């Protein structure tokens with residue numbers, strides 16, 4: 001198909017994320033290639049090279065078409081595409097589980113593979129519910145979180161999305177009613193943790209788990225909070241016997257400057273979700289990890305098993321590329337790489353602070369954010385960024401980037417320059 | 429790298445399996461080291477042995493594993509573009525696949541929402557149905573209706589429409605949405621069943637968004653078949669009472685029941701349809717939810733303005749690319765004759781099981797063969813007996829069953845059926 005033909009088919013038959021059919025303000029742009037940190041897009045019938053500043057929604061940590069990941073895939077493809085995980089096991093699943101259990105916060109000893117982040121969140125909730133049922137306490141079945149969060153689009157996942165301002169707001173009426181603490185602030189305030197404890201205390205007998213994104217809240221507003229809050233959550237959850245779940249689907253694999261965001265606080269959750277960058281952005285895969293204690297309690301319960309099992313569970317292809325992606329990350333000095341990236345983003349975005357429409361500029365590891373004083377118009381922002389050789393996808397009032405770790409200093413500055421110019425257009 | 433013994437050690441300590449325990453498994457999983465065509469290479473007492481994939485790795489491996497055309501499609505796409513975000517971008521694999529799916533599915537299904545698993549595709553279908561009625565100013569239409577015996581996945585919404593017994597709803601007291609269940613649909617056509625279904629629907633019509641069913645064949649919930657005329661009745665009932673009809677063809681799709689889609693046996697189109705499993709030829713997790721122009725426009729013209737769903741890896745180029753190849757390979761051969769031959773092979777091979785003491789039913793529908801027993805099939809007895817005969821079989825409850833790859837030769841079908849008959853013989 002030609003780019004024109006692709007556009008015609010797409011307009012007629014393809015639903016896009018959080019979109020309409022036939023009522024799109026803009027057509028999507030045709031992507032024809034991706035190599036390293038660069039995408040080849042079609043603009044006015046002509047191919048153009050642009051930087052993947054979003055890492056394809058925080059997935060492409062090693063860039064696209066990395067030789068190590070490409071070959072990990074083709075090697076596995078030669079041997080075994082897929083087998084059912086019921087009654088069978090395999091090397092890619094075992095290699096990946098071993099890696100994950102070793103590199104995640106201490107105590108996370110068991111791994112349940114699934115095919116997406118949302119599902120891995122549903123699995124985490126199921127683990128928590130079955131845990132308490134295994135303890136003879138089925139009343140512990142609600143979840144508690146703080147505002148500003150996002151955990152996916154399946155119905156249970158939706159129930160812990162930010163209620164007033166989050167994308168799932170119109171659905172309250174049919175969702176499970178969960179417990180919400182106020183928005184966690186950026187700076188550490190002991191009063192916030194005290195209020196969190198007081199609220200949790202009154203629901204403790206009906207709460208299975210606290211579920212949060214640690215340090216960085218992604219899709220709910222690219223907000224950062226002091227890691228000390230995670231220390232407080234761990235303590236509160238311990239004392240009130242509520243499980244603690246960290247959703248690291250966006251924060252995992254070095255993105256915030258530590259291997260996992262929980263590491264900023266030295267905290268171990270009882271249950272943890274990973275996804276996105278897990279596969280280096282080649283294929284959909286996610287994982288839910290839990291402690292031996294959680295695993296044993298579920299396994300000793302009336303169910304005698306965790307009642308979940310997706311068709312493509314532990315897909316060899318996805319696992320094999322993930323093994324390669326994780327090994328590639330661990331085999332380099334990733335901490336220095338992310339520190340250099342963060343410094344690059346900080347230096348490059350500094351000028352944005354002075355712009356009339358900019359309310360905040362913030363950086364955390366390989367995450368750069370310009371917060372504007374109004375919703376960003378994509379019809380203006382998209383071409384402006386493309387004009388400067390960068391693919392940016394603002395959302396709400398945020399112009400932000402989570403670049404591939406392989407971006408050179410020059411490429412980071414190109415990205416931040418495009419961000420600043422988008423922000424300039426917002427205010428003019 | 430890990431040896432089979434090392435794999436078992438890692439797996440026992442760290443890996444969850446579908447609907448399994450950690451540390452309380454009756455039998456260790458068997459190490460799978462390769463898969464090619466209709467055959468898996470498994471480790472039995474340290475030795476690699478080749479056995480037939482009688483289940484098609486749970487419906488998925490329709491062209492067998494490592495089909496050269498499907499391998500080549502994946503590697504071709506890998507050299508061009510592994511993945512890009514589907515927010516603001518489109519691409520050829522998504523367009524090519526959407527075009528194919530619209531063309532081959534029951535008439536009227538004009539739009540395609542890609543997701544990363546069957547459960548997610550079912551949640552998307554439910555979301556379409558609920559948002560549809562919100563767009564019609566009828567938000568009270570929020571419940572789902574189904575018949576007993578069904579299975580639609582493991583996420584919390586999907587669980588709510590699973591058979592209450594198969595889905596162990598007794599373990600989920602007041603966590604699941606309470607849906608409307610009709611009695612088990614019978615094998616033979618009885619107008620009284622449909623009249624009763626209609627009367628039950630009628631009294632719930634004002635609070636029902638949709639009827640959701642698996643058409644012709646109920647898979648994971650009991651491998652039951654029903655007369656296609658029941659689907660004709662559902663279409664009519666849903667039409668007259670203004671309730672949407674959703675067919676879940678995640679297991680039945682792509683020729684498995686002897687028609688391209690099971691709905692084709694009835695000459696009916698649903699308002700919303702789910703596909704998965706065989707979609708990718710079993711290479712990778714991908715699913716799709718299709719809906720009519722009416723459904724898509726009613727959602728889009730609603731005050732909400734957008735379907736609030738969008739998985740990170742939506743419309744993954746690699747998965748879409750191998751699916752395009754899998755669909756084209758199916759359509760480019762005389763698949764109808766192939767399935768007819770497979771059905772005949774299964775019928776002939778399983779015929780001797782009818783006379784066995786512990787056998788209550790023997791049934792075949794397209795490339796699906798089932799022996800139902802009068803008691804639970806003992807896995808510790810069933811596995812070695814099938815493995816001796818060069819066949820991987822996975823009985824559950826009282827059922828010994830197969831859904832073989834379409835590429836299976838008459839000799840392989842004879843091998844598969846003989847193993848099934850022997851498992852049934854040992855039950856009695």
Ligand SMILES: Cc1ncc(COP(=O)(O)O)c(C/N=N/C(=O)c2nc3ccccc3s2)c1O
Nearest residue numbers: 017116117118151152218219249250738739740
């Ligand atoms: C912390 C966290 N937990 C779970 C999920 C859901 O994972 P998944 O999409 O694989 O089901 C996610 C999903 N992340 N979503 C995205 O990064 C975005 N999707 C869109 C779509 C449209 C506009 C912006 C975004 S950000 C997540 O960040």
Ligand SMILES: Cc1ncc(COP(=O)(O)O)c(C/N=N/C(=O)c2nc3ccccc3s2)c1O
Nearest residue numbers: 086309310311446545546547580581648678679
């Ligand atoms: C009609 C239909 N709709 C939706 C789903 C859910 O798809 P997914 O597992 O990709 O989320 C499915 C999933 N089917 N699952 C399987 O056939 C099996 N899963 C397991 C798990 C453990 C042991 C046996 C089986 S069979 C389905 O058949």
Ligand SMILES: [Cl-]
Nearest residue numbers: 017018515516
């Ligand atoms: Cl978007």
